[PDB]
């Protein structure tokens, strides 16, 4: 069981894959829900590289290894992924130009 | 006019900077290139290109003519 | 330089025109000088050598 | 490679992050990721040390391909001073007719 903490008391439980709000990681309070398989993919690419930024080419290759996909698809994926993780202030995942995207992780429980 | 160097056009340091970075030295080299070829130059944006167009059109010249056996 | 004027002036009273700053007057004069040196607006003056 | 500057400022080149921390392995207050040319300038300042870098070499490294207006040099330094919150110019010192020097407390390899 691997669980990741995000700012504003957010948690994501990967093994069962639930995003939620909870003061206690073992006791959820408000369940945001289940991210999609490609959404979990997106958080995977942002998560395996912390604290280093994940380059745009690497995430694009990983998400769609066999698809002719434009970078606009990656960017709208980030946007409509914020649509689900409710990061209105762009603080959960930071976009730094010509260097890629990052996700702010407070702690990891394994 | 085809035998003057680029600096005669009196380009903004941004422009002359960019065109000196691509080894575009002569107005023939300016004209034989097209708008899309210039817009692909790093740090050469749309408004820079439009002011190049205005200044070069001041001197009766335009972009995109084909000059045979240049130079 | 004193063109169309009775006396020549140094950087001080040239600054006294609008803003009393020396290095700005120098840099403005140098910019004007390399701008005039440009071969496009100096052929009429080169003929006086 | 891990760089310490005055005032407990830690820069990690592998992850390329700068932050305030008493313990290098435990960030306390994150400043963040500098830009690309900021990284180039920092690496130059850390790579001629102890000696300072002459202006021609930093000029040729920050913008090699095209000769750039001179002010940009100083201006780039300003931002590399400002992002590292070096208001007192103690992290980047300028030696007249000698170049730019950076202050490194220690390096962890």
Curated annotation (Swiss-Prot), chain B:
Region (Alpha C-terminal domain (alpha-CTD)): 1-71
Biological role: DNA-dependent RNA polymerase catalyzes the transcription of DNA into RNA using the four ribonucleoside triphosphates as substrates.
Record remark: domains: The N-terminal domain is essential for RNAP assembly and basal transcription, whereas the C-terminal domain is involved in interaction with transcriptional regulators and with upstream promoter elements.
Family: Belongs to the RNA polymerase alpha chain family.
Subunit structure as annotated in this protein's UniProt entry: Homodimer. The RNAP catalytic core consists of 2 alpha, 1 beta, 1 beta' and 1 omega subunit. When a sigma factor is associated with the core the holoenzyme is formed, which can initiate transcription.
Name the UniProt record assigns to this protein: DNA-directed RNA polymerase subunit alpha
Organism the protein comes from: Vibrio cholerae serotype O1 (strain ATCC 39541 / Classical Ogawa 395 / O395)
Gene coding for it: rpoA
Span of the entire protein shown here: 253 to 323 of 330
